[PDB]
Amino acid sequence: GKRQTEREKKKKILAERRKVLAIDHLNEDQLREKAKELWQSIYNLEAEKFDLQEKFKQQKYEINVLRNRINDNQ
Amino acid sequence: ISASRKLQLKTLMLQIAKQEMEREAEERRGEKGRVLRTRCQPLELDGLGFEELQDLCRQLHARVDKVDEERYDVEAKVTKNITEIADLTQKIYDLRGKFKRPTLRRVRISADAMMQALLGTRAKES
Amino acid sequence: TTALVCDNGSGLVKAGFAGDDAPRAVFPSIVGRPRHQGVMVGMGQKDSYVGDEAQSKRGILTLKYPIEHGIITNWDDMEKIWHHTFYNELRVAPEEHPTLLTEAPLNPKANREKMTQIMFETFNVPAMYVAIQAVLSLYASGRTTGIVLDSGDGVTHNVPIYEGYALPHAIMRLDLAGRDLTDYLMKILTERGYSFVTTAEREIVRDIKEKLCYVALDFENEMATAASSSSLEKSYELPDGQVITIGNERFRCPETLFQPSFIGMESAGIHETTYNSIMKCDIDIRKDLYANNVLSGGTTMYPGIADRMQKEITALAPSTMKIKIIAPPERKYSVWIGGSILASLSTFQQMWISKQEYDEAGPSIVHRKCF
Amino acid sequence: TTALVCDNGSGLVKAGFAGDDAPRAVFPSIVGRPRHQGVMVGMGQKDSYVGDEAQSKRGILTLKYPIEHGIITNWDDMEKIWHHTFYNELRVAPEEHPTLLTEAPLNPKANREKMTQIMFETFNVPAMYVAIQAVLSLYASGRTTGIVLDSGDGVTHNVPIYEGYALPHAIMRLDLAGRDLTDYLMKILTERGYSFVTTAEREIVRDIKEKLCYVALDFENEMATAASSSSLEKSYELPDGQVITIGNERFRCPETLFQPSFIGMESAGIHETTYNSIMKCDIDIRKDLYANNVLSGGTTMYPGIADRMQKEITALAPSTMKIKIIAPPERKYSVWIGGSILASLSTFQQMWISKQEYDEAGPSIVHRKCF
Amino acid sequence: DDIYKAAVEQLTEEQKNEFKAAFDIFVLGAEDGCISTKELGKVMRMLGQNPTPEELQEMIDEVDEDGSGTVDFDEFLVMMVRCMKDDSKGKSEEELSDLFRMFDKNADGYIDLDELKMMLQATGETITEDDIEELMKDGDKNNDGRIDYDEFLEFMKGVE
Amino acid sequence: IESDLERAEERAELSEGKCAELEEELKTVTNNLKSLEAQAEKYSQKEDKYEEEIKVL
Amino acid sequence: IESDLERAEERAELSEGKCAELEEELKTVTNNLKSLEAQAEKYSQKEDKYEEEIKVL
Ligand SMILES: Nc1ncnc2c1ncn2[C@@H]1O[C@H](COP(=O)(O)OP(=O)(O)O)[C@@H](O)[C@H]1O
Ligand SMILES: Nc1ncnc2c1ncn2[C@@H]1O[C@H](COP(=O)(O)OP(=O)(O)O)[C@@H](O)[C@H]1O
């Protein structure tokens, strides 16, 4: 079931990228600690997102360059 | 300009291009840091009691899940681009490789190496 | 390290390191024991002279080729030939060099398996690979399509290839080759009075064939001309004097290629087995095969064969297709040049049959994925 | 942004940006894996050549259409075809372009739902819409009424429309089309000696059908004439020479359209299913449908069909009505031109199936209001 | 090799006199004065080895502006630097690709003439308009005026 | 000379292909002209018949 | 090879001449077809008017 694999893959994308959040047991002080950790995680995630966007842009640019080289050779 | 002179001309062209590439990368990193700082805004830590911190942590978890899914999407895009560029470079090799076999000769020794092997320790320049 | 591109062949062993233009050492593959008694003491007389040494002492030897028709009939002699090739003509121990043998199409399996077993047990090479003798000749031409007619000295085979995809159902292997032409020439020379019988004199007849014979553009006209004038009679000096004059034996010896009925063979000539090999291919790649017909092998070096073959195929083929016959000047070593090119490739570097693989599956590994 | 007007079809995929006159890239929809072994190393041999690339290497491939009769039988191959169409023939990423597929009438639901699911999950388009292949062909003619006979290569369907109100109870879908005519021509060519069997030679028979066949105005008279004179025998040169001469096979191949009993089908010809489709309509719109009969699709390009069909319908219809058959010269791309016109409309801009709507109702959204 | 060719083009006393001394020693059979094919082959053979003559002929005729079987000055240094491969083809394919993609300012995979000349002005090296036309023709393998990566690498061969 | 021959061959092939395409186009358009001329003749006859019908009625 | 190259180039020239002539023919026939299409449209209008008058009578 390749389609089953794709559907379970997208379900795992929606589920595993979700983490088990535990902040109600972390007391007000530990709640502040958890808020700081969550902010650090989300800021790092956004940095990774932007880096991936830029690398995708550059890879697309190199794809265009190589394809144009092919067209000139063909 | 002579042959060596025009070689140095194209070398300085490559040098100016390297300067441009380095400044492009530096400004890219600086402006992406600026954009992330506009996005990644630190929040105030003190003054909030338990419930507000819990709500903020729930919101942070939701944002983490969302941005993680988005990062997965962009990583898939990057993997697709890697596959496509690999195929294109392989087609480049197919178009102008394979049949580009050079004449591998084991009897054309290096001029210095050939002169040494035929004279001892005579050759030292090249 | 560098790879050893050996090429057993049948009649001339051609070897050399991968990446060069020409084989380093080319010498006949004959092993001849002495046959007389020998009276001088301490002369240092050996028991078997192999390679090019036995082409100089052939007056008192009984030369016998260890390879009859592609297949190997005398394994001890072949082992001796390989040992000589490695140690005296190249002077490189085989313990530190991969080898790339070559084999005719449609040969018995046992021959190939024994070859790999010898190379791995006796000489103890790091890794060896066996390749079909026609694909290499197609490499050397720098093409990627085309139907190659590799008329060696043992066996003539005709492998069509398109876009790199070989067509296994269209290989036409015929066992007429240079050796049968030598025997037929030796048999028709008797019509003038010259009798060559000894296995040493077969070499003299081979030299006559190489230096004098040529392929006639039109057979009947040449037969009529040689029977009236005398402009064809070329003379040749034997190894002792007594020059001989070859008349219409000049173009009758290599004519056997296009009419194998001369030596009693039933099959059709090399001009018609190529057309049959083409017609077995699919209907859409016949134009490309027509335009890229490749010649290789030693026996295709006769002066005037690239025109006779083109005329014959143009007669057989449809009138619209263009018939072109690629006949590079480096025909004799085409297979070995292609072998060098193939061994020098980076993509090919992981296809060798590594020794640990042979230890795990036995000699029958050659028929497996590592072809 | 601009919309992508793709049109899967069956036999030729036609695509291009909305708002132009002709499709940008038209190429056969075939995916052919190689079937032989392949001996050249590093030749860069792929595992599947799709589109127009596999019509040049068809000599060593096994071409297989992924769409049998309108319906799609091999979803992986269809996905490959779509990926090729988007990325290599148009070079526009689908993440930034709406798409407008086309589908034959009376097709299985699962086909349409799978099509929309693929377009939304794999290619991840912003919004896609599926339209019936006959309404577009009616758009391209600039009409608003008329009964359109869209005889494609997969399936022939006959959708009557009046004043913009389609009549769902009068659609007559018949599964005889260009492919069955190709098979029947390939089957009757054997009566002269020419045998085409391979799936690659089906393309050659298709070319013969396109270039030589024509529809006879009167069948019996043509059968009598071709059996006495020889003014019809037209010759054609195969891809390798050996010209062939087609006699009365010329007008017997496309005659199957008007007598489906030739290939064993029970139903009536395309000349009588149109009249039946008209007679199912109401009694007051039959004159307009008679006067605005529209032809479309590739298979209606036979020389002389717009007269045979008119003669047949005039024979069937009442003597007072005027029978007119609209046969624009741009018949082949009529569906795609209509698709471009429909996608370029402002009133249509809110009918697309937006992605958020699909996320809320699943692939079964296509059967809902957004048709 | 990249330094060898340039240095030997305007060489000082040392290695030019080494070449002259080699020429004077070669009088043990070769006395042509200007190195021809057969004298060169004889000199190479008398050294003690028999290399394949193809390398020698490509040294003596391919790179030359005459290719008549004789030996010129600059092409002798070309032969000397062609024994090995030290001139790295004008940098590496990765660096060249980066400089070309940033050079491709309109991002179309080709180098137009206008931005090419603007970048050439940015280079600031010694300017020879004749050399500029030479590079323009070197970038015309397909004769479009534009330089794609193929011809870019082609005329960058040996740029050190 | 071999390279020159290859160039000549490819130029001839392209020219022949264009010639074949033009032949097909001319064939199609001439057939259209013939059909339209037949239709025009029939239309003139029909017009005369219609005028006669108008008069008699 | 030289003789073959010369013959191929001559063939290419002949094919180019044929292509030019075919272009001329195609354009001429296209113009004629357009003229006859206009004529047929006039025929159609005449028939429409005659039919209407017949109905009235
Ligand atoms: N110049 C030549 N002219 C005619 N025949 C030749 C010539 N050179 C070799 N031959 C024939 O070809 C044979 C050598 O063929 P070769 O290609 O060495 O066979 P293999 O494929 O076993 O290497 C010799 O036996 C000889 O009969
Ligand atoms: N000029 C022509 N003459 C006769 N038949 C044609 C012609 N062009 C195409 N056909 C037939 O029509 C088919 C193409 O039909 P097409 O309209 O592309 O189908 P689809 O509706 O799937 O796009 C081809 O398979 C061919 O058999």
Ligand SMILES: [Ca+2]
């Ligand atoms: Ca010179």
Ligand SMILES: [Ca+2]
């Ligand atoms: Ca540019």
Ligand SMILES: [Ca+2]
């Ligand atoms: Ca250029």
Ligand SMILES: [Mg+2]
């Ligand atoms: Mg051989």
Ligand SMILES: [Mg+2]
């Ligand atoms: Mg259609």
